[PDB]
């Protein structure tokens, strides 16, 4: 059976899964339970970072990952870690 209570949560707001049509812009809102920590993002295949073809907007304890290059091939599994706590969400692409 499942446990009783989870460990110290480090994600104030988990980036719930979203849906975006191929080509359409897709952003994920992820808030950490602590400030100062650098929330690292990763996609199904390679890691994600604030650079071309992608976008990362961090502000204190908030982290929003913007992905405009998202397409029919992005219909995999999204992963995002923030120091110790690790969470991953699914991105359902629309056709």
Sum up the structure in keywords:
globular; Cardiac Muscle; Myosin Binding Protein C; 95 residues; Ig-I domain; Myosin-binding protein C, cardiac-type; structural protein; mainly beta; Immunoglobulin-like
Structure, described:
Belongs to the immunoglobulin superfamily. MyBP family. The modification Phosphoserine is found at residue 46. This is Myosin-binding protein C, cardiac-type. The protein starts with 17 loop residues before the first strand and ends with a strand. A 5-stranded mixed beta sheet has the order 1-8-7-3-4, with no helix packed on it. The protein has a single domain, classed as Immunoglobulins (Immunoglobulin-like, Sandwich). It has strands spanning 18-21, 26-31, 40-42, 47-48, 55-59, 62-67, 77-82, 85-94. The chain has 95 residues and is an all-beta fold.
* Record field, number of beta strands: 8
Total helical elements: 0
> Globular, elongated, flat, extended or rod-shaped: what is the shape?
globular
Query: For the record, what CATH class applies?
Result: Mainly Beta
User: Can you summarize the main beta sheet?
Assistant: 5 strands, mixed
Structural class: mainly beta
Give the DSSP E fraction (strand runs of 2 or more residues). 35-45%
Provide the CATH architecture: Sandwich
* Integer count of domains: 1
| Secondary structure: helix percent | under 10%
H/E element sequence: EEEEEEEE
Family: Belongs to the immunoglobulin superfamily. MyBP family.
Organism: Homo sapiens (Human)
Protein name: Myosin-binding protein C, cardiac-type
PDB class: structural protein
